[PDB]
Amino acid sequence: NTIERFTFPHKYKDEKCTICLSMLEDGEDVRRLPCMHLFHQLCVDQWLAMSKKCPICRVDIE
């Protein structure tokens, strides 16, 4: 929605998702925010569409 305009969805190629606490693994659908923080799409996309801010650093993606 608004999410895709301001962030970078892509396939991942040791980093941890801070939402689910699991390691980011090869081929997983992940998303980078303008602040450079990285999350699984599953974990972040619904929350982010509503908050429009990075869970970690609180910076608005817009």
Question: Within 13 Å of residue 44, how many CA atoms lie on the same side as its CB?
Answer: 26
Q: Rank residues 4 and 51 by Cβ distance to Zn ion and give the closer one.
A: 51
> How far is residue 36's CA from residue 62's CA, in Å, rounded to a whole number?
14
Residue 48 binds Zn ion, judged by CB under 5 A: no
- Options 1-9, 10-18, 45-53: segment touching Zn ion (CB under 5 A): 10-18
How is residue 10 written in tokens? 């892509």
Give least dist CB 52 to Zn ion, A: 12
> How far is residue 22's CA from residue 7's CA, in Å, rounded to a whole number?
21
- Binding stretches for Zn ion (CB under 5 A): 17, 19-20, 35, 37, 40, 43, 54, 56-57
